[PDB]
Design a protein around this nucleic acid. Structure first.
Lengths: 273, 244, 102, 169
RNA sequence: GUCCUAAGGGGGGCUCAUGGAGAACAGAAAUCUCCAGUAGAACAAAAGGGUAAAAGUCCCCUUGAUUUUGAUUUUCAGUGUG
RNA sequence: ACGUACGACCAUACCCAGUGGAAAGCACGGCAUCCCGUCCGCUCUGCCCUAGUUAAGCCACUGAGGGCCCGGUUAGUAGUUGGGUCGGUGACGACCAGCGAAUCCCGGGUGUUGUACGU
C-alpha cells in the first residue's frame, strides 16, 4: 500500500525552515534568548561563531522579534589586510578573528546629542563595566582544543567578558585537571602548523609540497610563523578598522543588480502558461 | 505522580502563594481573517516567552459555550487566552479571555479596524528584544469610570497581557520601549494600541530628553460584548496571599 | 527643550508594573489625516514616557553594581486577578564486616 | 553530463557478518575470525526480540559484524570474489547500487585452519557510492541524494563487469 | 532453579511496527542487505491535536541511597547549638 | 538581483521527476602528524583551498498526481435560544429577533521578509 496518501499529506506537520535546512538548533536557541539568571530586563549579546571551508565568520548578534541584528563582524579574509595570507581556517586565524571582533566592539562602543540612560543615572561610586556576552557556535561538535574556543580566547583576550572554563583549551589534561600553557602558547603563535611543516619536510617531501604549496610560493617559513602571527595581533590591536580590498572583480551595487537581472530567469505569466 | 518529571510538572501546575507568570493561549476558530491572524501573530511577538499557540481550527463560540476553553486551559496550564474569529456581523474580532481556577473569569471582544491596521513588519525601526518587558502608559478619560465597565476591564486585561515577569530591580537599559493605550470616554469610543521605541537625548539637565519612534503594531479596537465575573469568584480572584 | 510637562490633572504611577495612568483627556483631532492623528498620539506618548522616566529616575533608589545601573522599584500596587486560588538491596556480612547487595 | 569523474562508482563500505545464533565460545571464535581478517576489534550484535523456537532472547548477543573499508575493502572483496570465482547473480544486486554474496568457509578465503577456532560462514556485502555522500551524512545541513546521483542496478553491474572482469547470471 | 554498580539525571548517536524484492543450511516463523515506510512500534497517559535527527531505542559520565544556609511560611518543642 | 552566516513567519515553504546555473560564495573533495572519537577518519575532529567539478547539495524554472493557503458562494441559511401576538385542550401554530454552521460550487496561488558581509 502507498503510505504517502491524502491522509498522510493532510496531517503532515512541517518543521521550522532553518531546522529543515539543518542550520539552527531551535531547542538551544530558545534557551539562549528567552532564559536568564536575572530579570533586570537588560539586553543580551551572543557571539555567533561559524566555520566554513575557506572562511571563519564571527558576529556580535542581538535577538529581536522580527529577526537578529548584527552589532559587529570580523572575518578571516580581513586578516589578509593584517598580514595573514595562508591558513585562514586554522586555530590561529580563528583566535585572530576573535581578537579582531573584540577590538572592533570596543572601538565602536568607545571603550578602547543622544546619550544613554546609564550615563543619566550614573552614581559617583561607579566604575566602567566590561562588555558581557555568551558564546553560540551552533551545531558543531567540539572536542578539546576546538577552534571555536580560540574565537572565545581571542575575544576574552581582547576585552570581552565571556563566562567560561579552561577545560577545553589545547593542552588541558583531564587526569591532572590542569592546562598546559606552553601547548596553548604553541597554538597561539601557530607552532602546531610549524611542527607539521618541519615533520612533513623531513618525512614526505612530496606531501609537504602538495599541502603547503602556498607557503613555499610566498616564502612563509615555519620559524617565521611566530613573528608573523605576533605582528598581526599588534596591528589588530593598533588599527581595528583597517580597510581590505580583495582580488575579486569590483562593481557598484547597481551594476550587480543589472548583471544578475540579465542572468535571471523570469517567471512565466498566466497568458504564457 | 510516580514519574519524577510528571511530579515536577504537577507541582508547577499546583497553586502557590507566589504565582508563576501567566501563560496566554492563542487559538483560532473555524473562520478567521488574515488580518486577525496577523494581529494574533503581532500579539504573540510581544509575548513569545509566556505563550502557546494552536495551529488548527476550533468550532468554538466563546459567548455560547466555554467548556472547551476550560478544557484547553486545564490541559495547557494557560490563564490568559486570545481567540480569533471572523463573521459577517463582526469582521475582525479578538476575544480576550482570562481564566481563574481553570474556569472562565471574564471575556471581552475587540473589533479591529481593518483599514488602519499596520503590522510590525510594516514599520522599519529597531525592534524589541525577545524576553524584555515593555513599560505601559494608559491615557484618556475612559479608564477612571466609577463603575466597572469594559474600558476598565480592557485596561486590566492589557496590563495582564503586557505584565511579563515581576522583578524587584530593573536595568536602565531595559527602559527603551513603551506600550501606549489611548481611550477617551464619550458613537463608540476607539481603543488605540500604540507601541513606541524610546530614544534619550541630552537636555542640559540631569533628567534626559525623551524621544519616541513608532515600533509596534498600529491597532484600533472597538469594545463589544462583555462577560462580567460572578462576584463570589471575583472576590476569591482578588484575594491577595501574603508572601512568606 | 523642557523635560517636564504640565497638565490640569497630575499623573498617577505604578512603578512596580512600570505603569503610568493619565487621567487628563486626550483631545484627538477630528481630522481625516493620519499624519496629524499619529503626531498627536506620539505627543501624548511623549508626555507619558517623559513622566515615566522622570518618576523612575527620581523616586527610585539607584545602585551601581557590576551588572549595571539598577533601580529598585516598589512592589506593584495595581489590583490584578490571580490565576489560581490561594492554597533495601543491602545486607551486612558478618564474616567480612561490610555491606553488600542481594 | 555522465562524463564527470565524480560520478565514478566506488565502494562506500564492505560489511562482513557472522551469525552464529548463540552466545558463548562460538561467538568469541567468530569474533576472532573477523578480527584476524580485518585487523580491527569486532562488534557484538544483540537480538531485538525473543522467540522460543530459535533459542534466542532479547538483549542477548547473537551475531558479530565487522565493516571493512579503505584499500583493505577491495583486497577483502577480491578475496571473496576469488572464492566465488568472480561469478554473481542478477538477483544478488539491490536496486540502489549495492550488492553482496554469502560464503561458508573462511578457509577458502586464505586463513590457515586452527582447531581451536574452526570454520565459520560469512555474509559479504559491499555498499557503493559516488563523491557527494557527505551531504546526506554530515551533521550540519544534512539533505537527500538526488535521483540522477543515485546508483541503479544496471550501473553497478556494469561497474562490476568492468572492474573485476566478472560474470553476472 | 539462575542472572542483576538500584532507579534517576545530563550529553551524544540511530530510527521503529509492518509490507515488497533478494541471499548455503533457512523451509509461513531463525540471520543479513535494499526500498516503501506519521509513527499504524515502543514509552507514558486515557485527546476531541502526546513524543521522530524525540518524551522512543543504543553508547559516555554520575551513581553521592536523600547536601548546606535562612533573622523568612505552617506546625511542634520541660532535650529551645531548636 | 544572486550567494553566504544568523533569523521572523513555520507546507503558498511538503512528497516525486526533469531542465539550467555567468560571476563569486557554499558544496563535493585530497591527507590522517598534531587536538579528538569511532568496529570502520562513515560521523566528529585536525590539516589543505593547491589539483579535479557543477554530478549531487543549494537556487531558479517546468511537469503530473495529491496536499496546503486565500476570497466569494453556501447564508444570515440549517441549527440553538429567547420574546410576545392571537389561535391551538397544551405542546406549541406561525411571526419578531439574538447568536450563528458545515457540505457542495467557483475563482487565485505553489513563498515572502529582517541584519551583516560579498558578487
Amino acid at each position: 500500500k502507498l503510505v504517502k496518501n491524502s491522509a498522510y499529506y493532510s496531517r503532515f506537520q512541517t518543521k521550522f525552515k532553518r531546522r529543515r535546512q539543518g542550520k539552527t538548533d531551535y531547542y538551544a536557541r530558545k534557551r539562549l534568548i528567552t532564559q536568564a539568571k536575572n530579570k533586570y530586563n537588560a539586553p543580551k549579546y551572543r557571539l555567533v561563531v561559524r566555520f566554513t571551508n575557506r572562511d571563519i565568520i564571527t558576529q556580535m548578534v542581538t535577538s529581536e522579534i522580527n529577526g537578529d541584528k548584527i552589532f559587529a563582524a570580523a572575518y578571516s579574509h580581513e586578516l589578509r589586510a593584517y598580514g595573514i595570507n595562508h591558513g585562514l581556517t586554522n586555530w590561529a586565524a580563528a583566535y585572530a578573528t576573535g581578537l579582531l571582533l573584540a577590538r572592533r566592539v570596543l572601538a565602536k562602543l568607545g571603550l578602547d546629542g543622544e546619550y544613554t540612560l546609564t550615563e543619566a543615572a550614573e552614581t559617583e561610586d561607579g566604575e566602567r563595566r566590561p562588555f558581557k556576552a555568551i558564546l553560540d557556535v551552533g551545531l558543531a561538535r567540539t572536542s578539546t582544543g576546538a577552534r571555536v574556543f580560540g574565537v572565545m580566547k581571542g575575544a576574552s583576550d581582547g576585552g570581552i567578558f565571556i563566562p567560561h572554563s579552561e577545560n577545553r583549551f589545547p593542552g588541558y589534561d583531564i587526569e591532572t585537571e590542569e592546562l598546559d600553557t606552553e601547548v596553548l602558547k604553541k597554538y597561539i603563535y601557530g607552532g602546531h602548523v610549524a611542527e607539521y611543516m618541519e615533520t612533513l619536510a623531513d618525512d614526505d617531501e612530496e606531501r609537504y609540497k602538495s599541502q603547503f604549496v602556498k607557503y613555499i610560493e610566498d616564502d612563509v617559513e615555519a620559524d617565521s610563523l611566530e613573528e608573523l602571527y605576533a605582528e598581526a595581533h599588534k596591528q589588530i590591536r593598533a588599527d581595528p578598522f583597517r580597510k581590505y580590498v580583495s582580488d575579486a572583480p569590483k562593481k557598484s551595487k547597481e551594476e550587480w543588480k543589472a548583471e544578475s537581472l540579465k542572468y535571471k530567469k523570469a517567471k512565466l505569466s498566466r497568458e504564457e502558461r | 505522580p510516580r514519574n519524577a518529571r510528571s511530579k515536577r510538572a504537577l507541582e508547577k501546575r499546583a497553586p502557590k502563594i507566589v504565582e508563576n507568570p501567566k501563560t496566554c493561549l492563542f487559538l483560532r476558530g473555524t473562520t478567521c481573517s488574515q488580518i486577525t491572524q496577523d494581529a494574533m501573530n503581532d500579539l504573540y511577538a510581544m509575548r513569545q516567552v509566556h505563550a502557546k499557540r494552536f495551529h488548527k481550527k476550533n468550532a468554538i463560540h466563546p459567548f455560547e459555550d466555554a467548556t472547551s476553553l476550560c478544557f484547553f486551559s486545564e490541559k495547557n496550564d494557560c490563564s490568559l487566552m486570545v481567540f480569533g474569529s471572523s463573521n459577517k456581523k463582526r469582521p475582525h474580532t479578538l476575544t480576550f479571555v482570562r481564566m481563574f481556577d481553570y474556569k472562565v473569569l471574564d471575556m471581552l471582544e475587540f473589533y479591529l479596524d481593518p483599514d488602519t491596521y499596520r503590522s510590525i513588519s510594516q514599520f522599519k525601526t529597531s525592534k524589541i528584544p525577545i524576553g524584555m518587558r515593555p513599560m505601559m502608559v494608559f491615557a484618556g478619560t475612559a479608564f477612571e469610570s466609577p463603575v466597572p465597565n469594559a474600558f476598565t476591564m480592557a485596561k486590566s486585561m492589557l496590563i495582564d497581557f503586557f505584565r511579563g515577569e515581576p522583578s524587584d530591580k530593573i536595568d536602565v537599559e531595559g527602559l527603551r520601549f513603551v506600550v501606549v493605550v489611548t481611550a477617551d470616554e464619550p458613537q463608540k469610543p476607539i481603543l488605540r494600541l500604540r507601541v513606541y521605541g524610546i530614544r534619550t537625548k541630552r537636555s542640559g539637565t540631569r533628567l534626559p530628553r525623551v524621544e519616541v519612534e513608532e515600533h509596534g503594531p498600529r491597532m484600533d479596537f472597538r469594545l463589544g460584548r462583555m462577560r462580567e465575573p460572578d462576584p463570589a469568584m471575583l472576590k476569591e480572584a482578588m484575594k491577595k496571599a501574603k508572601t512568606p | 527643550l523642557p523635560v517636564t510637562v504640565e497638565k490640569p490633572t497630575p499623573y498617577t504611577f505604578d512603578l512596580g508594573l512600570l505603569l503610568a495612568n493619565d487621567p487628563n483627556p486626550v483631545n484627538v483631532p477630528k481630522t481625516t489625516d493620519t499624519q496629524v492623528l499619529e503626531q498627536h498620539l506620539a505627543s501624548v506618548a511623549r508626555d507619558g514616557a517623559q513622566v515615566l522616566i522622570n518618576q523612575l529616575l527620581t523616586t527610585t533608589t539607584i545602585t551601581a553594581t557590576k551588572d549595571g545601573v539598577l533601580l529598585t522599584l516598589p512592589p506593584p500596587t495595581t489590583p490584578l486577578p490571580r490565576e489560581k486560588p490561594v492554597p533495601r538491596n543491602l545486607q551486612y556480612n558478618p564474616t567480612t564486616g561490610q555491606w553488600e547487595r542481594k | 553530463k555522465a562524463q564527470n569523474p565524480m560520478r565514478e562508482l566506488r565502494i562506500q563500505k564492505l560489511v562482513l557478518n557472522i551469525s552464529v545464533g548463540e552466545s558463548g565460545d562460538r561467538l568469541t571464535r567468530a569474533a576472532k575470525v573477523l578480527e584476524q581478517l580485518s585487523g580491527q576489534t569486532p562488534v557484538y550484535s544483540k537480538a531485538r526480540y525473543t522467540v522460543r523456537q530459535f533459542g534466542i532472547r532479547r538483549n542477548e548477543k547473537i551475531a558479530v559484524h565487522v565493516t571493512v573499508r579503505g584499500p583493505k575493502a577491495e583486497e577483502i572483496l577480491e578475496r571473496g570474489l576469488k572464492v566465488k570465482e568472480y561469478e554473481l547473480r542478477r538477483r544478488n544486486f539491490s536496486e540502489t547500487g549495492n550488492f553482496g554474496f554469502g560464503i561458508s568457509e573462511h578457509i577458502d578465503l586464505g586463513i590457515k585452519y586452527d582447531p581451536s577456532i574452526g570454520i565459520y560462514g560469512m555474509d559479504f556485502y559491499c555498499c557503493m557510492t559516488r563523491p557527494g555522500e557527505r551531504v546526506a551524512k554530515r551533521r550540519r545541513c544534512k539533505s537527500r541524494i538526488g535521483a540522477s546521483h543515485r546508483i541503479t542496478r544496471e550501473e553497478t553491474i556494469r561497474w562490476f563487469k568492468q572492474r573485476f572482469d566478472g560474470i553476472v547470471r
